[PDB]
Amino acid sequence: CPTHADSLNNLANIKREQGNIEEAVRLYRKALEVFPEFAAAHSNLASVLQQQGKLQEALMHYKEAIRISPTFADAYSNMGNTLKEMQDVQGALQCYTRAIQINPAFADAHSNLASIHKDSGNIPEAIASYRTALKLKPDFPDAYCNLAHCLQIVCDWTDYDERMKKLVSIVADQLEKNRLPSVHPHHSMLYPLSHGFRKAIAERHGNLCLDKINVLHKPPYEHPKDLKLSDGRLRVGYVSSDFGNHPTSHLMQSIPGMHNPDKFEVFCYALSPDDGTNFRVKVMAEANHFIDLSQIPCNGKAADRIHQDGIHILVNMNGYTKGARNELFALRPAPIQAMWLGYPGTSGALFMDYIITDQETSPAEVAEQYSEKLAYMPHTFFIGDHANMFPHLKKKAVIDFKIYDNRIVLNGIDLKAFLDSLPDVKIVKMLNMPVIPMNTIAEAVIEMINRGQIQITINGFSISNGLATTQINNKAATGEEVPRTIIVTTRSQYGLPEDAIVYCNFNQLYKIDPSTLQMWANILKRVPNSVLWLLRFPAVGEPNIQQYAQNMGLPQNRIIFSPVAPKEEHVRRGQLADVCLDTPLCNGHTTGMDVLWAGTPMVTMPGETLASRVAASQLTCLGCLELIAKNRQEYEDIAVKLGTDLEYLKKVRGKVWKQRISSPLFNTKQYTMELERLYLQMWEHYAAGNKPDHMIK
């Protein structure tokens, strides 16, 4: 009877909804035994195989469905989703556009198409396609939530209050109905969800990994219980997709080579191929062992490799970010598995034992936000390679074009040597700051900037225009190499005023919300002449910020945007600001380290989530407790005092300039030593027969 195959197919759909994927596969396949030319069953089966990570087998069954039924729009759209996951973006687009051509009223295909535009940087078209999807299917949580993030990205705050209400309502309903939430874990920090909901979102996303490893039917691994096979050395494995030109390497690329080889054996497992940068060269050369798991796409075979290396502590540096293979941690090839540095939040997952953090970022009273046990670094868990990558910013000089420390700035590895040749430099006490008077050399430097010249030569020294680094040395621009020339950086290069206070924030615009811009407006209104210096990320968000600001009483000329710059220029131009205003909703993490390395004080208000408390952890390690606000009033008052009491500003900027060197904040050698002490507490605890517990010392 035709009822037979139909009943099996429709029952399987129910089992899929309930999360019973294995039974759904069983039913789909029985349907195909009963009715071999069953297009719907081929496509539905392919959809659950995709969910199990069997992407080629899924593609085979999609193509079968379409061979049977050439106008089967469901199969085209589902197949597009599989090609998108295989990184075949053009193939995905061709499938989505064919599905919509077949059925213009196909809401799911419009939404899946929108996700391609979103990921491609075409946010206006993503918004248009998500809005078509919601018009066709008004109850559509994936489309609604991904539209909400598009609007977050461009700072469109139209009906933002009602938007947050519905987002929370959607998540509440999906969690209650045991479904995967449509908000991604890495985005949940941006919305007013409870901590329980954020951890539950994370746990549900981690459960997707289980569906992909269960099909491997691998038994549990036997784990080492001593250090005998490793000559007393603890074997640490760092797993990352980001050994290459990516901010995580800009933070920790020095740490593998700084481990003590008498007590530790370091294994780096790359989840990405070699991008040819010095970042990848350095870790490959400095780790005791480097393993390219991008050549081993099966998570079962890759986990076998980790286990065969005898890893004691395996470190997850991705969490829920691009490039992750958390399936490797779900298989538990190591007895101790810790989250570290790359992902600002909990995995929510049973297969992670620890999250490496600190008492400022994650005070014990908020342990319930995390599924992991807390493992405290003694100062901050954050670290940066700035001292190794940007030593040319350790010193600076200025030109006295009239004395300011941040209107016309020179930096250079050989800057002192250059200044020895100029007998008329003045040394100002505030280290010390040399001041070049308005002489012939200074006029030539100023003329280079105004004329837009690339570089000039004075007394044999190359003097470079800071806007032209990629034409001079592309590897210096990326941070792969230390710049060799003396670089000139000026407020005129960025359209900043020479006679007023500059407040900067160089974060993605999606970290700003209405509450934050209101607080910044309050500050600018209390500091005459001051401006706010923001990042075009993306540019299409600029007119939204300007409209909301002008609506809050700020003329347009009070807000100055700059394009995204190469890594080195981005850190170097932080020296032109007077003060950095950190985003309370989700702090600057890498960019907080960047402004502090330039000597620019950062004002912050720590929240409750991990991501909202990192900047205050950094400032505590640095030793500037006066930059940490307990509430919005304090945040505004601190920023206004820095912008109006210029003697106080000089004092605080001098503190940052000095303590970026003397504090532990950028000291990678000390960090590695402290990290090693923490690993050994974890190991001794385990070796004594104990399950993970808080390591808050």
């Binding site: 429709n10 959809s47 989703n81 998108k84 996951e85 899946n112 991904n146 970010t321 691009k322």
Partner: peptide, 14 residues
């Protein structure tokens, strides 16, 4: 930035 999730469609047999 991570890949934006997509929505699979389940086809009902009728």
């Amino acid at each position: 930035t991570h890949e934006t999730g997509t929505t699979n469609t389940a086809t009902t047999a009728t």
